[PDB]
Amino acid sequence: SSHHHHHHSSGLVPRGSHMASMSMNGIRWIASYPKAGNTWVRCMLAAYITGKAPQVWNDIDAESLTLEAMLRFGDLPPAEPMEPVLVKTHLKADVPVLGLYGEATAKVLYLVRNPRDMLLSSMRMASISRDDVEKSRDFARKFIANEGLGWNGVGLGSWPENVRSWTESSSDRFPNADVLTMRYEDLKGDPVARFSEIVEFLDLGGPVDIEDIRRAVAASQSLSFLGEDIESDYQELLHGDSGFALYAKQYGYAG
Amino acid sequence: MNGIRWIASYPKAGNTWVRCMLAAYITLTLEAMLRFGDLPPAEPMEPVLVKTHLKADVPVLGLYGEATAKVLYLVRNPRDMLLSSMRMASISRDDVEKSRDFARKFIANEGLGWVGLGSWPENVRSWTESSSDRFPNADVLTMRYEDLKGDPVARFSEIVEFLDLGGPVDIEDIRRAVAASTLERMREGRYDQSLSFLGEDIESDYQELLHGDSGFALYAKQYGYAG
Ligand SMILES: COC(=O)[C@H](Cc1ccccc1)NC(=O)[C@@H](N)CC(=O)O
């Protein structure tokens, strides 16, 4: 009977090195809005580093693996890390806590997704069938009204807030950090190509093994049906120079 | 004076009630904040009351050694906590089935944390032996929830004075606070402090926990919860 985290340790003793005889340290944030890619990348990453992907049945499971779940219990990733630390979060780049990793942060992976999809996939978080249209409308109505899911100057923020925080992060909040940005739809289109780019970009050490990545991969909408006014109101969001719209058009989710 | 004030207790062991009567007097929850990535100020002009159930020695609270003015720890007979927690887990205590499961996991873990809350003794030690390293500016007051219920007036008095929130404290002003904090709550088992009603073995095992070598027993006996 072994501990459920044994795969996170080599368990080799005494420990040896490939770098010495006789990749850059820092935090790697895997960041996205809910249902916008960072759980999948966070699972794939485990598979690559560890050999074994975590067991994620639902959103509660997925939330276990975030900075936020870690915070609810008073823990924190290291701020003076001696190695690569990968931490998933959906939090906005400018919430106070992440103030502590200014110097610490090495890499930012930000993933965005079509908010149509985020919106629907989210409706499964709140435990809504496709048949309680009533509940759906209320959720979508509250989503469209908020331009996102942060309804209960911090937390997730609106979609455009979240996006602007991480994508603009390198300039001030994370000076030593490089930032890569990837649309979920692209990942889903070419997952092996794309995840190999992510692993290069995250600089965990050594040559990316494209076979190591293929195995690590294998492990892994209109709103009319809710009502005219839903689809309609969401479409106002995509019109503008104002923010939701700017981002929706830059990421190819408006037309 | 100015600095952080922790209102700390195990779940359902006091701090909410007290955070209510301070609220009522005047007119922050650490874990809730933290879940949004928010932190109480580490450089404060004002006094800052913050309620937490976490054990004092969690990393996050390490950001606060200098910032911390006072600690109020609240403590409560575990039996009663064990039973209020049951209701928090949204289980009727007509339903012995789930109730048993729950009590059994409580006793197995010497508390409600199955980092974090900690066991019950880990939590008590954490805040009662903590000025020692974690919060060396702070003055620390422990208090049994029982006695608070016993003399809300004379005990809450002790509190408001101790935290030093607002100049001088009037008994009039105080009276209105324990009024609402209970009048509000009031709108919202065996009588011998026994768990036998959930079956003998359960009582048997809590009893063993209370009268062994384990620390739970230690802190129990020193506060008047070992009978
Ligand atoms: C954060 O990641 C997600 O929300 C997961 C990640 C994922 C994608 C594809 C295959 C497995 C897992 N995806 C979704 O929410 C789903 N909505 C994907 C879909 O509907 O096609």
Residue in B37, B38, B54 closest to A74 by CB = B54
Residue indicated by tokens 């965005």: A112
Q: Give the β-pairing of B4-9 and B139-144.
A: unpaired
Contacts 24+ apart (CB under 8 A), A143-149: A143/A119, A144/A230, A144/A233, A144/A234, A144/A237, A147/A237, A147/A243, A147/A244, A148/A33, A148/A115, A149/A33, A149/A34, A149/A122
Looking at the DSSP assignment, which residues form a beta bridge with residue B71? Answer: B6, B140
- The side-by-side arrangement of strands in the sheet containing A26-32 is A84-89, A26-32, A105-112, A178-183
Residue in B36, B58, B116 closest to A95 by CB = B36
Which of A224, A243, A242, A244 lies closest to A232 in space, CA to CA?
A: A224
DSSP three-state, residue B109: coil
Residue indicated by tokens 């720890």: B73
Contacts of A61 (CB under 8 A, 6+ apart): A54, A55
Distance, in Å, from the CA atom of B129 to the CA atom of A194, rounded to the nearest integer, reads: 52
Q: How many CB atoms lie within 10 A of CB A177?
A: 21
Q: Give the β-pairing of A105-112 and A178-183.
A: parallel
Backbone angles phi, psi at B78, to 5 degrees: -50, -45
Looking at the DSSP assignment, which residues form a beta bridge with residue A89? Answer: A31
Residue indicated by tokens 């209510």: B20
Tokens of A126: 């709140």
Q: How many CB atoms lie within 10 A of CB B59?
A: 15
Return the sign of the alpha-carbon dihedral for residues B150, B155, B157, B160: negative
Looking at the DSSP assignment, which residues form a beta bridge with residue B61? Answer: none
- Which domains are delineated in chain A? 1-255 (3.40.50.300)
Tell me which residue has its CA closest to atom 17 in ligand 1: A121
Q: Give the β-pairing of A84-89 and A178-183.
A: unpaired
- The side-by-side arrangement of strands in the sheet containing B48-52 is B48-52, B4-9, B68-75, B139-144
Tokens of A139: 């959720």
Intra-chain end-to-end CA distance of chain A, in Å: 55
Ligand 1 site residues (CB inside 6 A) read: A 35, 37-40, 121, 220
B210, HSE (Cβ side, Cα atoms, 13 Å) = 18
Q: Give the β-pairing of A105-112 and A26-32.
A: parallel
Distance of CA B161 to the CA centre of its chain: 19
Distance, in Å, from the CA atom of B22 to the CA atom of B15, rounded to the nearest integer, reads: 10
8 Å CB contact between B74 and B7: yes
Intra-chain end-to-end CA distance of chain B, in Å: 41
Distance, in Å, from the CA atom of A67 to the CA atom of A43, rounded to the nearest integer, reads: 15
8 Å CB contact between B47 and B68: no
Contact B34 A91 (CB under 8 A): no
> Is residue A14 reached through a cis peptide bond, with omega within 30 degrees of 0 on the bond before it?
yes
8 Å CB contact between A183 and A251: yes
Residue indicated by tokens 């009588």: B191
Which residues of chain B neighbour A75 with C-beta distances below 8 Å? 58-60, 115
Looking at the DSSP assignment, which residues form a beta bridge with residue A32? Answer: A111
Distance, in Å, from the CA atom of B153 to the CA atom of B164, rounded to the nearest integer, reads: 17
DSSP three-state, residue B68: strand
- Give the distance from residue A161's alpha carbon to the nearest chain B alpha carbon, in angstroms: 15
A117 alpha carbon – ligand 1 mean position (Å): 10
- Give the distance from residue B137's alpha carbon to the nearest chain A alpha carbon, in angstroms: 21
Return the sign of the alpha-carbon dihedral for residues A98, A100, A101, A103: positive
Distance of CA A45 to the CA centre of its chain: 12
DSSP three-state, residue B141: strand
8 Å CB contact between B29 and B51: yes
> Catalytic residue numbers of B?
53
8 Å CB contact between A141 and A213: no
8 Å CB contact between A30 and A38: yes
> Catalytic residue numbers of A?
90
Which of A110, A99, A98 lies closest to A37 in space, CA to CA?
A: A110
Contacts of A65 (CB under 8 A, 6+ apart): A39, A42, A54, A56, A88
Residue indicated by tokens 């002009």: B45
Return the sign of the alpha-carbon dihedral for residues A157, A158, A159, A165: negative
Tell me which residue has its CA closest to atom 13 in ligand 1: A35
Which residues of chain B neighbour A98 with C-beta distances below 8 Å? 37
Contact A96 B31 (CB under 8 A): no
Q: What string of H, E and C letters represents the secondary structure of chain A?
A: CCCCCHHHCCCCCCCCCCCCCCCCCEEEEEEECCCCCHHHHHHHHHHHHHCCCCCCCCHHHHHHCEHHHHHHCCCCCCCCCCCEEEEEECCCCCCHHHHHHCCCEEEEEEEECCHHHHHHHHHHHCCCCCCCHHHHHHHHHHHHHHCCCCCCCCCCCCHHHHHHHHHCHHHCCCCCCEEEEEEHHHHHHCHHHHHHHHHHHCCCCCCCCHHHHHHHHHHCCCCHHHCHHHHHHHHHHCCCCCCHHHHHHHCCCCC
A25 alpha carbon – ligand 1 mean position (Å): 30
8 Å CB contact between A138 and A132: no
Encoded amino acid at A241, one letter: D
Encoded amino acid at B51, one letter: K
Which residues of chain A neighbour B36 with C-beta distances below 8 Å? 68, 91, 95, 154-155
Distance, in Å, from the CA atom of A219 to the CA atom of A56, rounded to the nearest integer, reads: 12
Contact B60 A75 (CB under 8 A): yes
Which of A73, A106, A66, A104 lies closest to A87 in space, CA to CA?
A: A66
- Taking the CA atoms of chain B, what radius of gyration do you get in angstroms? 18
Distance, in Å, from the CA atom of B87 to the CA atom of B95, rounded to the nearest integer, reads: 11
DSSP three-state, residue B87: helix
Distance, in Å, from the CA atom of B131 to the CA atom of A180, rounded to the nearest integer, reads: 45
Substitution candidate for ligand 1 out of A43, A58, A121 with most atoms within 8 A of CB:
A121
